Amino acid sequence: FHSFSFYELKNVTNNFDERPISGNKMGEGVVYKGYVNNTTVAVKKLLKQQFDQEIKVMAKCQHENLVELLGFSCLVYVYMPNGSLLDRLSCLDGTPPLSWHMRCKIAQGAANGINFLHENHHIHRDIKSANILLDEAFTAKISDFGLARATVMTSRIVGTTAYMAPEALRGEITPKSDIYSFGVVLLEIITGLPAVDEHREPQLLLDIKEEIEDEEKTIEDYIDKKMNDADSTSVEAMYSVASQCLHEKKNKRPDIKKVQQLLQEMT
Ligand SMILES: Cc1ncc(-c2nc3c(OC4(C)CC4)nc(Nc4cnn(C5CC6(C5)CN(C)C6)c4)nc3cc2F)cn1
Incomplete structure (x- = not known):
């Protein structure tokens, strides 16, 4: 350096x-x-x-x-010429919306990033769309390693509430919590909606998963309208990965290598 x-x-x-x-x-x-x-x-x-x-x-x-x-x-x-995924998803400063194809590349690349970290025995502890930055070609790049950690518990609970796994809000430090957070991120990529909005019902995006499961709504009803290239098949395929990631029981979630696999199979 x-x-x-x-x-x-x-x-x-x-x-x-x-x-x-x-x-x-x-x-x-x-x-x-x-x-x-x-x-x-x-x-x-x-x-x-x-x-x-x-x-x-x-x-x-x-x-x-x-x-x-x-x-x-x-x-x-x-x-990073294209800022964060959060800002691009909300079209901050008038940037045009991300197409389905661009969003797939972003999801795929972000999973690869997490896989590299998990491969090098590191836990991010704060995976969120604000920490997923985009270069000149919109390649996803994971950022903020300040709270990263090389099963274990802490008395000082840190992270972003809307993205945190249930066991992570209880103090647990597991790489499986990063998987949960990635599933919230996949939901933002599908819906274009922020993980939390106080002036919204439901306030929490991960709550839409329950609405879909209890057939009150569909994933089709929640797809970002600011796209023209999304096809039902691949959108349902990303939601299925997101659903698996968001399992309340940490050991029932897939590993990052399988999340990485399910995203490739999607394209
Ligand atoms: C620990 C840690 N801290 C910070 C970094 C890190 N952060 C950012 C970063 O952070 C933010 C999102 C808060 C501002 N922003 C950017 N670039 C950017 C920011 N905004 N824009 C927009 C997009 C346009 C200008 C509009 N369109 C015409 C082009 C580009 N590069 C970054 C690069 C980094 F390494 C990494 N690790």
Whole structure:
């Protein structure tokens, strides 16, 4: 890695411009746009124990479906031209909707990323569409390794509530919890709906699974209307994977290698 100095990064961010574009701030520590020679970068100005793991994971783990850390002193990353899956799903700033075909590539790539992490004996602990970033070609790249962990329990429960497995909300640290979170992500990819919306009924997206099972509604009734290329067969095939992931009994969920397999078979 490139061992940076806090003054260089200030000028690249132009005195750390905490403002939109109409500045440098892209969103949120905080993340601002920048440049190093020609290389566009996202700098994360940040807890100390979290920074140690972020560098540990980024040094051990290198994959095309994971983000790349360039510098540290303030973690520095290759700017992602298409932001997060969350923002692209909600068409933030007027970006056009993702087609079914693009969404499949995203799901597939994100599973590959998780498989690489599970292969290298690591648990993400915070899989969510905001942590799935997209490059110039919309390749999915898993991000945020600060709370990552190399069955085990903790008294300090952390993550994003709407994405968390039941046993994860009880304290458990299992790689099977990441699988549950990925199933919520697959539901957002199908529906284009955020995992949680206070001004919505149901507020929680993982509740639609129950409505479908109790035949109150169909998966067809929940498919994102902001697409023209989705076919019932492959949509039902992604929902089936999502359903399997979202089993309340952690040992009844598929492993990431099988999730990865079911996504390939779909295309
Ligand atoms: C621990 C950790 N922290 C942060 C990263 C990380 N984060 C981001 C990142 O984070 C955010 C989503 C909050 C802003 N954003 C981006 N790029 C981007 C952000 N917004 N946009 C839009 C998309 C357009 C501009 C509109 N359309 C015309 C192009 C692009 N790259 C990133 C790269 C990274 F490595 C990784 N690991």
